[PDB]
């Protein structure tokens, strides 16, 4: 009765092109296994991987539909007990990434008993159906080459993007910084907390790992890829005080989706 290691569904390289067009219909359509909320669990053998996957978002529905077109069938292909958190940014205030991240562990662990989470980019599609989105021994980096960054790894310590950890490895780092407000940075401080709880970080090769980007027609501008960020003390200093047991937000609302459930936050209380 248990899921096989590797599932029989498999497909191996897969065809991800953004030049086509789709609506939230089409992909209910296409998906009728998947129940309110964007809740799905193995019929035909028993999952222990019960993964909430969390999606820090502002204003990008577009984005959107394209990862729920492509990830719904390729998470029932890897036979997970899943479900699917978009957590939404109120207000215009500089964007953090990683407590609204925060946010969703807490509010998934609401709904169900999950044991794993993986966190998500709204924009990045996995290129490869064996690059499996759950948990591991060690905290698993996903998204490995990222056409974004010429199909290359910036640096060895570098975790953004997608990458899983279960319920007790993020325990065990006391979550994610709460204020690194704006973009950069808060990806290395994860790196820095679980170096420093005794973990090191997981990872498939780069070619199972191709990973593509949707392109955002603003964005025009270009620059290098990233450097590593040194804040090893900061994180030192910080970490046991600030994360998931300093976190406080509201909740605006609460939306449940034929594909998704969306939570609209406000992050402005201090943390």
Not at 68 to 97: C, K, T, W
Not at 117 to 138: A, E, G, K, W
Not at 251 to 265: A, D, F, G, N, S
Request: hydrophobic share 35%; aromatic share 12%.
């Amino acid at each position: 009765t248990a899921c096989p290691e590797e599932s029989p569904l498999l497909v191996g390289p897969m065809l991800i092109e953004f030049n086509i067009p789709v609506d939230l219909k089409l992909v209910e359509q296409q998906n009728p296994k998947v129940k309110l909320g964007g809740r799905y669990t193995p019929m035909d053998c028993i999952s222990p991987h019960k993964v909430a996957i969390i999606i820090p978002f502002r204003n990008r529905q577009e984005h959107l539909k394209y990862w729920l077109y492509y990830l719904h069938p390729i998470l029932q292909r890897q036979q997970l007990d899943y479900g699917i958190y978009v957590i939404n940014q109120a207000g215009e205030s500089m964007f953090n990434r990683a407590k609204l991240l925060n946010v969703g562990f807490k509010e998934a662990l609401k709904d169900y008993d999950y044991n794993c989470f993986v966190f998500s980019d709204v924009d990045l599609i996995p290129m490869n159906d064996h690059n499996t989105y759950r948990c591991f021994s060690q905290p698993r980096h996903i998204s490995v080459a990222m056409d974004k960054f010429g199909f290359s790894l910036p640096y060895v310590q570098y975790f953004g993007g997608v990458s899983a950890l279960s319920k007790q490895q993020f325990l065990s780092i006391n979550g994610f910084p709460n204020n690194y407000w704006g973009a950069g940075g808060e990806d290395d401080d994860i790196y820095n907390r679980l170096a420093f709880r005794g973990m090191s970080v997981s990872r498939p090769n780069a070619v199972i790992g191709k990973t593509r980007m949707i392109r955002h027609s603003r964005d025009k501008k270009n620059e290098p890829n990233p450097q590593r960020f040194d804040r090893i003390a900061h994180t030192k200093e910080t970490m046991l005080s600030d994360g998931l047991n300093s976190l406080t937000y509201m909740v605006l609302e609460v939306q449940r989706y034929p594909l998704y459930t969306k939570i609209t936050v406000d992050i402005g209380t201090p943390s």
